[PDB]
Amino acid sequence: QSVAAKTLLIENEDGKGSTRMEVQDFMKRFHMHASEDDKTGSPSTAWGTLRFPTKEATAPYLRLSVNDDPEDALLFVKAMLAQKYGETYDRPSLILSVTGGARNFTLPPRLETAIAKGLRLAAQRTNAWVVTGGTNTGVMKLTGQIMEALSKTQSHFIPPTIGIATYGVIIGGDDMTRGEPPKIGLEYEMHKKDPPKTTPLDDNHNLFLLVDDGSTNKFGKEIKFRAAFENAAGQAFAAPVVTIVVQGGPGTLGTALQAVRQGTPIVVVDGSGLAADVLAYAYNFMHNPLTRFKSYTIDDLRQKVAQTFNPKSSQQLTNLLDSALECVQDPNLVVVYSLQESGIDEFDDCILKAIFSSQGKLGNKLKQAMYFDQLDVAKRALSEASKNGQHNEIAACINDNLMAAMMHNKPHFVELYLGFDAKIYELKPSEEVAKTNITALDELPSFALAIEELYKREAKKPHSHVQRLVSLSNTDVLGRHYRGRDLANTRAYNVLRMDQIFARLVSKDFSVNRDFTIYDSKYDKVPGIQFRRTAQASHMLFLWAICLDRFRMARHFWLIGDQSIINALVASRILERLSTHRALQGPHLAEERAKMQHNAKKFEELAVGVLGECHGSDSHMASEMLHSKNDMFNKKNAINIAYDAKSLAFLSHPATQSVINADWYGHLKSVTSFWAVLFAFFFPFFVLPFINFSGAHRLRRKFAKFYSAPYTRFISDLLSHFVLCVVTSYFVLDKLEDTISAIEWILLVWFVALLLEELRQMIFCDGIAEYISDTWNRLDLIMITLFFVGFFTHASDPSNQDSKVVSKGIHAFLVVVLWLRFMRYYALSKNLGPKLIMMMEMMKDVSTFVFLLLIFLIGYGVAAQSLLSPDEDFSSRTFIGVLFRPYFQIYGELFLDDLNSEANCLGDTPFTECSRETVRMVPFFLAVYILGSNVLLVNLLIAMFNDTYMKVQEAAEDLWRKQNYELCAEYKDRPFLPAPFILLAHVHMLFMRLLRLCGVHTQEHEKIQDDETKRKITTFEELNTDKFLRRWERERQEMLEARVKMTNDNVVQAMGMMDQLLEHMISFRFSLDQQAEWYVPPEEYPKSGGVKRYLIDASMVPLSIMCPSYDPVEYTHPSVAAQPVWADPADPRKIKFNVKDEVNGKVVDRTSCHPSGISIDSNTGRPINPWGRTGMTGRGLLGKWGVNQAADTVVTRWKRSPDGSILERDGKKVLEFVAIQRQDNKMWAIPGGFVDNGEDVALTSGREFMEEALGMGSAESKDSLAALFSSGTIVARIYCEDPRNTDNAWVETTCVNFHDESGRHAARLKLQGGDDAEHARWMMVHGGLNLFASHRTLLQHVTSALNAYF
């Protein structure tokens, strides 16, 4: 059962954390209306969760008012997601608004499949919030059906499908309202007839917001609130809002128009229907450069709109047509998806294209491109930005993009961003770290804080193994194993502590050395510093990638850095130990754990592989690389690391074994056999000079090298132990004297020296636990203990005979252990050593044989002893009789003569004529016994040995190869002098320790390899690493499975190509099948405050017609009546019309182009307009009596696609002119203005063009603009159909066209609306333009002159 929530985490307005507050306290801010009349309203009692049939999960619902804040509703959705999925839920990087048809519609299956596939891919990759209407009809129901499969096929996080619906139309509203909130799991009955509503809610939507205004059955109350919520969500999550238009009626066109106007991009699904097909045609008409769109015309679009929506009136059709053409004006904000052009799997690419055309900046576009997993798009965008001189923005956003690529596990994107000159060690954290009192932590660079941010961000996720690893580690902040609190928690995932955790994971004495001092600016001049900074940075990132088990990024950082082999071994050890750990146990963590083991093996393979390649190329150089001491792991070589990582595969390799055997012999040629080194040992001056060598300067150096060799110390220890065995053996065989003899004193000194060496090893080397673990140290302790017990037994009373006998008895055991201990030196041999390991394995079979024989031995022995002597008291002799002869009869010594004597049988035949008949059963029992022991048990032991031997021979060989290094390491650190004389070595070490600790008169000296040989080793290792990876990749591509898989995919691609072929075929099938005028101005005068003219019909406008019923209204605007400089005087007397007239000595164009001319009224002296009646006398808004000369500047260029081809419509080339949107009435118009005093059309045209299209106004661009402005042609001088025109003042225009044939000069113009223009843009010229006044006639004249489309 589901427990109702009592408290909710509401995110703060600062966006930093969530505060917990009661549900009843939070919900008070939402209101509901009981009736339409109500405005203030009452609190909402309708909120909770709804349970829908055949749906497992419940959907939350909140009924809120129209006046309610959309931020509060956004907080509600965030609170629900925060409760269900935890605080660290996947934030949306995309808001998908689905609008369209309210009524039900059927789409084609392929188109539906393409939309469904693309929308599911986009939604699951970006964690997008899909906002629809929420009702169970049409596009909302369709979107629900698309997201239903996403909710079924995917686990954990499901992207919300928010439905915002009006409450006044919803079935079942009263049931939802009445009750005590919250209603947990309330049943919704969509088929129940709740009067008078017939609209049900979609059952596949994950949340519901019911917006109420008190009305009933009045749809569309929530359209604005929905737009406000989408905009609010987009600002809050810094995510683009993408509207998707499928189908769609007349209101969808206005919705899409609203969406474009607010800057929100739209994706129109072509082939769906109605508004979408109309919008798709219209865009294709205004932008697409393909050959099949060249036949597109407005007439056919108008025909399409008329046949599809069927308007009642022509004005409605005109308004729909104007709005439809207005939507696709800006090509960036509209993206049309079509099946026959883009493709079935290209809808998410179209969504990404809309996103890239929406927000213009490199960082947002690259982050979204990462989210959709389109590297090619990101690569092309980066290349285009690189070519166009946008390198600064690239460098400014590359870090944040690289950080984002690391967080979301995208290695290919990591490789891309790193390739475009982004330094790996220049990473910066997103937040700012607070200052810390610790000097080690304050020394840390920026990229360390960036790695700390990656650890923190990954760690805050639910059920993360990193948090368990850090908590179970039981360490402080700097990683030391010591177990205030606030720092220890805010910076718990620092890099030093993580380095310490990984160090414990490798072994007990692994300590990685960091040097962050090299990242200061003072070291930049040092040669090769950029490599070192790179390498260290790479290493730290590498370790982070090993911890999160991301193999691909780990492999990438491993290949970027250096010291490949050692890093692979360390990685293998950390992953193998990490997979079997307390932090990774759990039912849900199983598969990753598995992954870890897999990854471990892979790294191990790498470590072996590279090494192998090295041994193929140069054996000596490979030997040199394995001997190199590396500073980062406390100055020791790769074999030491490999032993610490327990890499049995690496140690058993022939190259590694060759270096271990080269370390043996102390690097000399002729020292190879036992006899050669033994002969050279005894005879130093007679075999060493005449031998291959790798003055007192040289002979002394070779002597110090030969006797410093570990093999020589082994030979010295063997010879020493052999003399000890021989001398102790003679001592125990020869009789003891009546006093302590000289040989006894020599043996006493020898065993004290041995005892002191064992104590020195215990206190000063490994540890007591480590010493006792070894079996040979235990044997050493037993032999010293036995000798001292025997020696003190003799020395207590030397003349006592009994003491001599007991002392030799103890010393018998001493000689047995001494000769048994001599076997320890057999382990160095390649023949005797593995066999010794095999003997220790076969001891369990020996124990099995002993347990089985013991049964038969005691059973037969008690029975036989009782049978031989049935009338004897039990004594110690009875017990010996039970074990003596039974045990020795299994080795073939049968005491049948002795048994015959004991049985008292006097016959010649062996057990006849006996005193008792029972004793005649003595040979029968024996007969059974030796059948059991010799024929059965011994032969089974032979069978067990053969089986055991075959099983553990290879493992014994591998274990011997690890022990070869162990023995080499052991005899490297050992004291130089042999056992009897080691006391001198002990006193020498004590003297050095006293002189070093107290005296401080000496130090340690060593040799450091040059940088030349170091970079030589580094180059070799890097080259062979690349060579092994190439060989490994080629070998994996030549496998049979890979070839079968690749041929299979090729056959799949072949069908795909046939599918394309069939589409082209069906297209021909279709192709072959089809192969067989008076102007009357509006009544209300503009900008006059509602003053209206005298209305006249269009058949009464001409001046030739009489029209006696004419009573115009005299109105003059306040602006004209205030008398500015460009306005003529209110009294028109003394002014001459029909000729160029001089005002203040400057000529103005007062002559009209009308053939009749301007007529002067006799009564008032005012001029009369020759272009017809306008129902208004006076000057109105026009400043000049008669002809107001205006100049219009049509700056044109050919509309070209990026490829360079000119766009073509109706068989004519299409022009494009700069058009401005007027400030006063928000209608688009041609830029222009009245001709000033003393100037011509050239100056007026240029000044108006600079003022309107350019606003404020260089260098070359000014020269291009001057070159474009130097060739203008007066195309027309006509009368304007301007609504401010009256009978005594009318506008007459001169049109000047500035055409850019090449298009170079026009492309440098930065269009930006200024003065009395709101926006300016390039707009294609056509006959369906809704422009101000008679500017269509002027463009018609421009296109007529240039033979362009109209």
Ligand SMILES: CC(C)CCC[C@@H](C)[C@H]1CC[C@H]2[C@@H]3CC=C4C[C@@H](O)CC[C@]4(C)[C@H]3CC[C@]12C
């Ligand atoms: C761990 C192993 C190798 C050591 C075995 C212990 C040996 C050294 C000890 C343990 C018990 C000892 C025996 C105990 C009793 C006696 C009886 C005495 O009248 C003569 C010596 C003799 C026979 C001892 C000889 C030494 C002895 C066998």
Ligand SMILES: CC(C)CCC[C@@H](C)[C@H]1CC[C@H]2[C@@H]3CC=C4C[C@@H](O)CC[C@]4(C)[C@H]3CC[C@]12C
């Ligand atoms: C126990 C199973 C395996 C087989 C049984 C065989 C036993 C019961 C048989 C085999 C050999 C037999 C013995 C052979 C001969 C003699 C001599 C006779 O004057 C008295 C009985 C005596 C001493 C027999 C006693 C029973 C005996 C021990």
Ligand SMILES: CC(C)CCC[C@@H](C)[C@H]1CC[C@H]2[C@@H]3CC=C4C[C@@H](O)CC[C@]4(C)[C@H]3CC[C@]12C
């Ligand atoms: C193939 C193998 C198992 C052959 C079997 C041999 C058996 C049947 C033989 C071997 C030795 C024999 C024993 C040898 C000696 C004596 C003592 C005699 O006073 C009675 C019979 C008795 C006790 C025999 C019984 C049978 C005997 C146990």
